[PDB]
């Protein structure tokens, strides 16, 4: 699982 | 699991 | 598990 | 487990 | 994120 | 993040 | 982060 | 961070 916040 | 906050 | 805060 | 705060 | 293995 | 192995 | 092995 | 091995 990958979650990326930008 | 990877979570990255930017 | 990797969590990175920037 | 790696947690990095920047 | 929750991952459960059974 | 919670990971549970059973 | 919580990891539980059973 | 909590890691429990059983």
């Amino acid at each position: 699982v990958q979650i990326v916040y930008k």
Side-chain angles (χ1 to χ4, degrees), chain A:
Chain A
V1 174
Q2 188 187 58
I3 297 180
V4 180
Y5 298 94
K6 310 189 182 199

